[PDB]
From a paper:
We also included JCPyV and HPyV7 LTA cNLSs as controls for strong and weak monopartite cNLSs, respectively. As expected, JCPyV LTA cNLS bound as a monopartite cNLS at the major site of IMPα2ΔIBB, with no electron density for the peptide observed at the minor site. The thermodynamically dominant P2 pocket of IMPα2ΔIBB was occupied by JCPyV LTA cNLS K129, making interactions with IMPα2ΔIBB through hydrogen bonds (G150, T155, D192) and a salt bridge (D192). As expected, JCPyV LTA monopartite cNLS co‐migrated with all IMPαΔIBB isoforms, implying direct binding. Indeed, JCPyV LTA cNLS bound to IMPαΔIBB isoforms with Kds between 76 and 270 nM, whereas bipartite cNLSs measured Kds between 0.1 and 36.1 nM. Most monopartite cNLSs are fully functional, perfectly fit to the consensus (K‐K/R‐X‐K/R), and can be expected to bind to the IMPα major binding site in an extended conformation, similar to JCPyV LTA, SV40 LTA, and several other monopartite cNLSs (Alvisi et al., 2023; Conti et al., 1998; Smith et al., 2018). Furthermore, all tested HPyV LTA cNLSs exhibited IMPα isoform specificity, with those from WUPyV and JCPyV binding preferentially to IMPα1ΔIBB, and that from KIPyV binding preferentially to IMPα7ΔIBB.
In the best characterized pathway, importin (IMP) α bridges cargoes bearing basic, classical nuclear localization signals (cNLSs) to IMPβ1, which mediates transport through the nuclear pore complex. IMPα recognizes three types of cNLSs via two binding sites: the major binding site accommodates monopartite cNLSs, the minor binding site recognizes atypical cNLSs, while bipartite cNLSs simultaneously interact with both major and minor sites. We combined bioinformatic, biochemical, functional, and structural approaches to study this phenomenon, using polyomaviruses (PyVs) large tumor antigens (LTAs) as a model. We addressed this possibility by x‐ray crystallography, and solved the structures of putative bipartite cNLS peptides of MWPyV, STLPyV, WUPyV, KIPyV, and MCPyV LTAs bound to IMPα2ΔIBB.
Author numbering:
A (entry chain A): 72 to 495
B (entry chain B): 125 to 133
Write the structure that this text describes.
Amino acid sequence: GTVNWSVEDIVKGINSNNLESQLQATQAARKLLSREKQPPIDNIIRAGLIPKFVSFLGKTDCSPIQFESAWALTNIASGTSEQTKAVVDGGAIPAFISLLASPHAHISEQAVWALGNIAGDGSAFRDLVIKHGAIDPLLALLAVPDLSTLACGYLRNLTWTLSNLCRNKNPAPPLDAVEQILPTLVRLLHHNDPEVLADSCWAISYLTDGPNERIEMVVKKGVVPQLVKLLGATELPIVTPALRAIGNIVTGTDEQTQKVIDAGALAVFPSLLTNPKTNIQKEATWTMSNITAGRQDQIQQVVNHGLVPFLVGVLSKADFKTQKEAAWAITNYTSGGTVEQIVYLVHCGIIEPLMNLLSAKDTKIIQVILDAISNIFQAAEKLGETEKLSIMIEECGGLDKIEALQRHENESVYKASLNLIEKY
Amino acid sequence: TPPKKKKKV
């Protein structure tokens, strides 16, 4: 019926003065734009059809054409920034926001979806959607006593669009908009659907990826315990955004990091630091590095949770990017730690893997490692055991690597290596 | 990361 139409036939039908013919042509366009292979978005735009679809969004008397035009415009807005821009330039934002209040759940859902695509384009279209007043009706759609009464796909689409409204930076979302959205986000973060949980966690991760004031807006809502619980989840689509959010939070003040620790997060890191997925291990080690950059009692919590052996393990064997995060964690630990804590670090076996990593072709990791060795040597001086550490670094082949670094292209690399050999 | 945009099929 409306399958495999030409763009010219669609234009002929939409340009007719017959609402039923216009509806059939719009459905044909929807089916064309839903094609898995090279949907003809640019041809549809060139034909000048976007303004007609936008006008159809306002046909309250013909709900089917509202839905078909909404779907077609959704699939145009799902493409390039230029195609999304073509949708926005047609005046689609206010029309979709008006449709958010439709009595038909599938039309309201389609409007939510379209606004999600538009906002997902970037910060400018996100903020423009916000300025047109989308947040109030979107959140009103979720103002129910129990989210479980809503259709699964409906709730998932609402959660995803809300996450896009929290997404992107340069600039970050308006502070008032974040404050308006956060309570509903917390509620969704306590829902029991894995996709809703994943997207709510990703939204929180976006909101925490910024200055300490943003992190504080999030942490003040009391979501950190729920984030740690989700960090313990079995589904990777949930653990990944939870771990990203926790890492973001520990990039903030030591008190925010202490909220993460107080919620029991460290107890999950034995698994995370051995997780079979490379990215989980990497982000867990990065979180650890930002925790070891904190106070000495926080480093002591890391020690008490038995996590130093796991850092030694990552340093000994892991993807190189995870190993670099581990070197950073070791250098932060040695920078802020007590003498006893650095001694513990050595007793756990950090010297050999660090020395083995000195053979890397990444300047930054070599600087990190040499700085860590310098810190460890300072502690040794405080204990008068620099000779023990020198012997230990020699037996594992470390002195050879540092002597090679004495002749390195980077200035600070050779400076630090020369200083280490000269002074030790 | 979730998709920035989604096509309805």
